Design an enzyme around this catalytic site. Structure first.
Site, short mmCIF file in Angstrom:
data_model
loop_
_atom_site.label_atom_id
_atom_site.label_comp_id
_atom_site.label_asym_id
_atom_site.label_seq_id
_atom_site.Cartn_x
_atom_site.Cartn_y
_atom_site.Cartn_z
N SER A 244 0.33 -1.39 -0.08
CA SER A 244 0.26 -0.07 -0.14
C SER A 244 0.37 1.21 -0.35
O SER A 244 1.56 1.70 -0.96
CB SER A 244 -0.36 -0.27 1.44
OG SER A 244 -2.11 1.13 0.58
N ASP B 113 -8.80 -6.67 -3.91
CA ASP B 113 -8.83 -4.94 -2.65
C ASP B 113 -9.93 -4.34 -3.29
O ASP B 113 -10.29 -3.77 -3.86
CB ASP B 113 -7.76 -4.80 -3.82
CG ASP B 113 -6.75 -3.56 -2.91
OD1 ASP B 113 -7.56 -3.14 -1.61
OD2 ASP B 113 -5.42 -3.46 -3.10
N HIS C 199 -6.87 -6.37 0.26
CA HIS C 199 -6.10 -5.83 0.60
C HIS C 199 -4.63 -6.62 0.60
O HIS C 199 -3.31 -5.77 0.55
CB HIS C 199 -6.38 -4.24 0.85
CG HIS C 199 -5.22 -3.32 1.14
ND1 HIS C 199 -4.80 -3.17 -0.04
CD2 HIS C 199 -4.42 -2.81 2.00
CE1 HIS C 199 -3.35 -2.16 0.15
NE2 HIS C 199 -3.63 -2.02 1.22
#
Length: 243
Positions: free
Chosen positions: A97, A190, A220
């Site tokens: 991320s 995600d 995610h």
């Protein structure tokens, strides 16, 4: 200036001095080294020198995080890159991320990085601009496996979201500075970072060696999810090929 809360159990940074090829691992926004630790441990076991820092304002309390800017987060990763540089002839960077955002950012400013492995990296999250309170209730860990207990903050400071937005905008704007080989992981499902981010990155970087690997059995937080083994295995193949 400094963190006012102690480091949470499980959020400690991880270092391992091994061979002349090094890997920097960057965790995500509101997250901690916990999200990257199985990767870090696997890479150390494989003989790589490993640096997994704790981002400033992370792994303590969300009130600490609120006091930081994206420059503080960039500094933690620049410091870890520096640590490896003093020890390693070849350096790779990987991250989840915002950790992926910071992987891209570092590669945009340091041409000597030999490869990047962004994982659900974030350069555009339209939901931020679309969306008051000082702290939002954090969304549950977006993990397909419900048995995993991600260590992340239970509230998200809205001021920090703004910092994330600015970091992403700067990173997105400079994507074409990147030319090192890229292995880009993306979870089809995600629910946090839109998967099209993988393609913004793929198309935006100037690299000649690049590919997208679609993860079909993860949400995610893929580094802790069912696809963890494949992330580790292909990342190790990538490191060996480019070292």
């Amino acid at each position: 200036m400094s963190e006012q809360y102690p480091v949470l159990s499980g959020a400690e940074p991880f270092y391992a001095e091994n061979g002349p090829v090094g890997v920097l691992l960057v965790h995500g926004f509101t997250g901690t080294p916990h999200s990257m630790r199985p990767l870090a441990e696997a890479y150390a076991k494989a003989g790589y020198t490993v640096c997994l820092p704790r981002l400033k304002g992370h792994g303590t309390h969300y009130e600490d995080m609120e006091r930081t800017t994206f420059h503080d987060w960039v500094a933690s990763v620049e410091e870890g890159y520096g640590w490896l540089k003093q020890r390693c002839q070849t350096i790779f960077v990987t991250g989840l991320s915002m950790g992926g955002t910071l992987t891209l950012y570092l590669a945009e400013h340091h041409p000597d990085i030999c490869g990047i492995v962004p994982i659900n990296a974030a350069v555009d999250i339209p939901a931020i601009a679309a969306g008051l309170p000082r702290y939002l209730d954090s969304i549950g860990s977006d993990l397909k496996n419900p048995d995993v207990k991600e260590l992340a903050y239970e509230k998200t400071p809205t001021a920090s979201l703004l910092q994330l937005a600015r970091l992403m905008a700067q990173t997105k704007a400079k994507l074409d500075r990147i030319v090192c080989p890229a292995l880009i992981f993306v979870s089809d499902e995600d629910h946090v970072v839109p998967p099209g981010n993988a393609d913004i990155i793929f198309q935006g970087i100037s690299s000649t060696e690049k590919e997208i690997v679609r993860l079909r059995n993860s949400y995610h937080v893929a580094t802790l999810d069912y696809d963890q083994p494949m992330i580790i295995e292909r990342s190790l193949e990538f490191f060996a090929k480019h070292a």
